[PDB]
Each structure stands twice: as C-alpha cells, then as structure tokens.
Motif scaffolding. Sequence first.
Motif, PDB file in Angstrom:
ATOM      1  N   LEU A  39       0.791  -1.218   0.000  1.00 46.29           N
ATOM      2  CA  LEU A  39       0.000   0.000   0.000  1.00 46.29           C
ATOM      3  C   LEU A  39       0.816   1.256   0.000  1.00 46.29           C
ATOM      4  O   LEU A  39       0.487   2.182  -0.747  1.00 46.29           O
ATOM      5  N   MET A  40       1.858   1.314   0.824  1.00 40.98           N
ATOM      6  CA  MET A  40       2.595   2.555   1.093  1.00 40.98           C
ATOM      7  C   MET A  40       3.961   2.719   0.458  1.00 40.98           C
ATOM      8  O   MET A  40       4.484   3.802   0.484  1.00 40.98           O
ATOM      9  N   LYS A  41       4.552   1.637  -0.064  1.00 39.64           N
ATOM     10  CA  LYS A  41       5.958   1.629  -0.635  1.00 39.64           C
ATOM     11  C   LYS A  41       5.916   0.989  -2.008  1.00 39.64           C
ATOM     12  O   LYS A  41       5.016   0.207  -2.291  1.00 39.64           O
ATOM     13  N   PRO A  42       6.910   1.299  -2.896  1.00 35.70           N
ATOM     14  CA  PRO A  42       6.930   0.454  -4.099  1.00 35.70           C
ATOM     15  C   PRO A  42       7.136  -1.026  -3.670  1.00 35.70           C
ATOM     16  O   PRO A  42       7.767  -1.327  -2.622  1.00 35.70           O
ATOM     17  N   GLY A  43       6.609  -1.924  -4.486  1.00 39.40           N
ATOM     18  CA  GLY A  43       6.929  -3.359  -4.364  1.00 39.40           C
ATOM     19  C   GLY A  43       5.658  -4.091  -3.941  1.00 39.40           C
ATOM     20  O   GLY A  43       4.536  -3.520  -4.010  1.00 39.40           O
ATOM     21  N   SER A  44       5.787  -5.291  -3.427  1.00 40.09           N
ATOM     22  CA  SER A  44       4.699  -6.154  -3.290  1.00 40.09           C
ATOM     23  C   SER A  44       4.932  -7.020  -2.038  1.00 40.09           C
ATOM     24  O   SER A  44       5.961  -6.917  -1.394  1.00 40.09           O
ATOM     25  N   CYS A  45       3.901  -7.709  -1.665  1.00 33.20           N
ATOM     26  CA  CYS A  45       3.979  -8.458  -0.370  1.00 33.20           C
ATOM     27  C   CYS A  45       3.274  -9.816  -0.574  1.00 33.20           C
ATOM     28  O   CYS A  45       2.193  -9.915  -1.131  1.00 33.20           O
ATOM     29  N   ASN A  46       3.879 -10.883  -0.029  1.00 30.82           N
ATOM     30  CA  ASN A  46       3.232 -12.191  -0.006  1.00 30.82           C
ATOM     31  C   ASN A  46       2.823 -12.565   1.400  1.00 30.82           C
ATOM     32  O   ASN A  46       3.635 -12.399   2.360  1.00 30.82           O
ATOM     33  N   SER A  47       1.596 -13.038   1.522  1.00 30.50           N
ATOM     34  CA  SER A  47       1.097 -13.392   2.920  1.00 30.50           C
ATOM     35  C   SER A  47       1.069 -14.890   3.002  1.00 30.50           C
ATOM     36  O   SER A  47       0.625 -15.599   2.047  1.00 30.50           O
ATOM     37  N   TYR A  48       1.397 -15.443   4.186  1.00 32.10           N
ATOM     38  CA  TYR A  48       1.368 -16.912   4.447  1.00 32.10           C
ATOM     39  C   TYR A  48       0.789 -17.193   5.790  1.00 32.10           C
ATOM     40  O   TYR A  48       0.666 -16.244   6.660  1.00 32.10           O
ATOM     41  N   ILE A  49       0.359 -18.444   5.960  1.00 35.90           N
ATOM     42  CA  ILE A  49       0.056 -18.884   7.317  1.00 35.90           C
ATOM     43  C   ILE A  49       1.037 -20.039   7.542  1.00 35.90           C
ATOM     44  O   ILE A  49       0.995 -21.071   6.868  1.00 35.90           O
ATOM     45  N   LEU A  50       1.888 -19.890   8.546  1.00 32.58           N
ATOM     46  CA  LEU A  50       2.778 -21.004   8.916  1.00 32.58           C
ATOM     47  C   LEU A  50       1.987 -21.955   9.776  1.00 32.58           C
ATOM     48  O   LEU A  50       1.128 -21.479  10.614  1.00 32.58           O
ATOM     49  N   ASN A  51       2.222 -23.247   9.573  1.00 33.46           N
ATOM     50  CA  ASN A  51       1.468 -24.248  10.344  1.00 33.46           C
ATOM     51  C   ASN A  51       2.495 -25.251  10.841  1.00 33.46           C
ATOM     52  O   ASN A  51       3.078 -26.039  10.049  1.00 33.46           O
ATOM     53  N   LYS A  52       2.713 -25.274  12.146  1.00 34.74           N
ATOM     54  CA  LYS A  52       3.744 -26.136  12.678  1.00 34.74           C
ATOM     55  C   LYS A  52       3.279 -26.580  14.046  1.00 34.74           C
ATOM     56  O   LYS A  52       2.970 -25.749  14.911  1.00 34.74           O
ATOM     57  N   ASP A  53       3.207 -27.911  14.225  1.00 31.04           N
ATOM     58  CA  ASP A  53       2.967 -28.457  15.591  1.00 31.04           C
ATOM     59  C   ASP A  53       1.628 -27.931  16.166  1.00 31.04           C
ATOM     60  O   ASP A  53       1.571 -27.659  17.435  1.00 31.04           O
ATOM     61  N   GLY A  54       0.636 -27.891  15.306  1.00 26.96           N
ATOM     62  CA  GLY A  54      -0.707 -27.453  15.673  1.00 26.96           C
ATOM     63  C   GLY A  54      -0.906 -25.980  15.939  1.00 26.96           C
ATOM     64  O   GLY A  54      -1.928 -25.568  16.502  1.00 26.96           O
ATOM     65  N   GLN A  55       0.073 -25.171  15.540  1.00 30.84           N
ATOM     66  CA  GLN A  55       0.013 -23.741  15.805  1.00 30.84           C
ATOM     67  C   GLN A  55       0.047 -23.080  14.461  1.00 30.84           C
ATOM     68  O   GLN A  55       0.848 -23.464  13.614  1.00 30.84           O
ATOM     69  N   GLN A  56      -0.831 -22.108  14.255  1.00 32.14           N
ATOM     70  CA  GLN A  56      -0.849 -21.290  13.049  1.00 32.14           C
ATOM     71  C   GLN A  56      -0.324 -19.867  13.368  1.00 32.14           C
ATOM     72  O   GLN A  56      -0.486 -19.317  14.458  1.00 32.14           O
ATOM     73  N   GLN A  57       0.445 -19.330  12.399  1.00 36.44           N
ATOM     74  CA  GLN A  57       1.038 -18.062  12.618  1.00 36.44           C
ATOM     75  C   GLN A  57       1.164 -17.338  11.261  1.00 36.44           C
ATOM     76  O   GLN A  57       1.831 -17.810  10.336  1.00 36.44           O
ATOM     77  N   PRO A  58       0.576 -16.161  11.146  1.00 40.09           N
ATOM     78  CA  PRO A  58       0.754 -15.358   9.931  1.00 40.09           C
ATOM     79  C   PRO A  58       2.234 -15.004   9.743  1.00 40.09           C
ATOM     80  O   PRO A  58       3.003 -14.771  10.680  1.00 40.09           O
ATOM     81  N   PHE A  59       2.623 -14.880   8.461  1.00 41.46           N
ATOM     82  CA  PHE A  59       3.956 -14.492   8.114  1.00 41.46           C
ATOM     83  C   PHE A  59       3.867 -13.750   6.787  1.00 41.46           C
ATOM     84  O   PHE A  59       3.010 -14.073   5.950  1.00 41.46           O
ATOM     85  N   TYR A  60       4.797 -12.875   6.539  1.00 44.18           N
ATOM     86  CA  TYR A  60       4.863 -12.151   5.217  1.00 44.18           C
ATOM     87  C   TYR A  60       6.299 -12.150   4.732  1.00 44.18           C
ATOM     88  O   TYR A  60       7.266 -12.193   5.511  1.00 44.18           O
ATOM     89  N   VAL A  61       6.418 -12.005   3.412  1.00 45.85           N
ATOM     90  CA  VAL A  61       7.675 -11.551   2.823  1.00 45.85           C
ATOM     91  C   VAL A  61       7.395 -10.376   1.867  1.00 45.85           C
ATOM     92  O   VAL A  61       6.413 -10.476   1.093  1.00 45.85           O
ATOM     93  N   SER A  62       8.125  -9.293   2.076  1.00 51.04           N
ATOM     94  CA  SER A  62       7.909  -8.129   1.190  1.00 51.04           C
ATOM     95  C   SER A  62       9.083  -7.954   0.275  1.00 51.04           C
ATOM     96  O   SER A  62      10.234  -8.346   0.567  1.00 51.04           O
ATOM     97  N   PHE A  63       8.745  -7.304  -0.873  1.00 48.49           N
ATOM     98  CA  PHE A  63       9.704  -7.072  -1.886  1.00 48.49           C
ATOM     99  C   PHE A  63       9.732  -5.591  -2.233  1.00 48.49           C
ATOM    100  O   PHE A  63       8.663  -4.930  -2.187  1.00 48.49           O
ATOM    101  N   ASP A  64      10.946  -5.050  -2.478  1.00 48.59           N
ATOM    102  CA  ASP A  64      11.031  -3.647  -2.876  1.00 48.59           C
ATOM    103  C   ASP A  64      10.574  -3.410  -4.328  1.00 48.59           C
ATOM    104  O   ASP A  64      10.131  -4.323  -5.032  1.00 48.59           O
ATOM    105  N   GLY A  65      10.709  -2.180  -4.816  1.00 51.46           N
ATOM    106  CA  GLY A  65      10.238  -1.880  -6.195  1.00 51.46           C
ATOM    107  C   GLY A  65      11.027  -2.585  -7.280  1.00 51.46           C
ATOM    108  O   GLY A  65      10.521  -2.710  -8.398  1.00 51.46           O
TER     109      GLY A  65
END
Length: 87
Positions: A39-65
């Motif tokens: 939204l605020m910077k050039p580039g793009s973002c990937n969203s994930y849900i990590l799933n390990k040992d019965g626990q879910q956790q959001p995670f992202y990786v962002s990329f510059d322009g």
Amino acid sequence: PVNYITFRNEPLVKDVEKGMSQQEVLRIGGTPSGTQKRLMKPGSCNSYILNKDGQQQPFYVSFDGSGKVDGSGFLSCSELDRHERDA
C-alpha cells in the motif's frame, strides 16, 4: 506473542534472505495465501500462514520496487500495510 523457536526451521523463516527474487521465494515457501501490491511503498507483499505443531502463525515476505526481498515478519501483509500507513 510468537515463539520463534517453534518456527525457526520453517523454510520461509530459515531460508528467505534480503535481496532474494520473487521466484526464489516462491520455490522456498510454496504458494502464498495471498499476494498484493504494497500500500505505502513500491513493491509487493506475499502473505502466508505457517502451520507447525498445531500452531498457526501469519507471516509475510515483502519485496522492494526492484522485485527483491526487503522484509519479512510474523504478521500478514494487510497488517504490514496498517503499520506502514501509521508509521
């Protein structure tokens, strides 16, 4: 409050590095839950849900322009957008 130890061996956490291309991240991490333009910077973002040992956790990786990783962390891309807009 994320227990980093639980997730430390997840490929998205252990193997994604600054400067990495979008295609290398796709190979390491598999299909994102979602992708979007930053939204605020050039580039793009990937969203994930990590799933390990019965626990879910959001995670992202962002990329510059240029298309190269500039960030990652234990929140969604829409959380990230919420943060870059405020900060």
